[PDB]
Amino acid sequence: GQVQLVQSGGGLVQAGGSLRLSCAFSGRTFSMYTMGWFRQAPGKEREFVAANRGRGLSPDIADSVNGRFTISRDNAKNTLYLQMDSLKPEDTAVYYCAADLQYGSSWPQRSSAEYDYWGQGTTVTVSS
């Protein structure tokens, strides 16, 4: 399965504003992958943000962003999204999407080490 994840979106945003991140999947059967968002802030551990399953209806969303960040996938475009609302300075980070084949994966899966494929990352900088 030739798999690649290509991210789009991000950049500068004002505190209180909104951004939507994109993660385009190339390869066979998007729906057999658990897809996750992680972020890396300076001096902090890599943080799980949100994840969903190939055909799942109930995503897993970290407490630190619950009520502000939402996730979905568009199967026609084979693309995963992260909608980030009510952005705060502490949301500044490099954001990555990751994919894991659902044969043998855990659910939920908040450990980055268990994801096999990774996007190139996009930097989100929240200004005040």
C-beta of residue 43 within 8 angstroms of C-beta of residue 57: no
What is the three-class DSSP state of 104? coil
Number of separate domains in the chain: 1
- Solving technique: X-ray
Residue 121 is classified by DSSP as -
> Is the separation of the CB atoms in 100 and 52 below 8 Å?
no
Within 10 angstroms of residue 62's Cβ, the number of other Cβ atoms is 16
Q: Which residues constitute the domain of residue 43?
A: 1-128
Distance between CA atoms of residues 115 and 128, nearest Å: 34
Q: What is the resolution of this structure in A?
A: 1.6
Distances (CA, A) of 63 to 67, 102, 120: 8, 24, 25
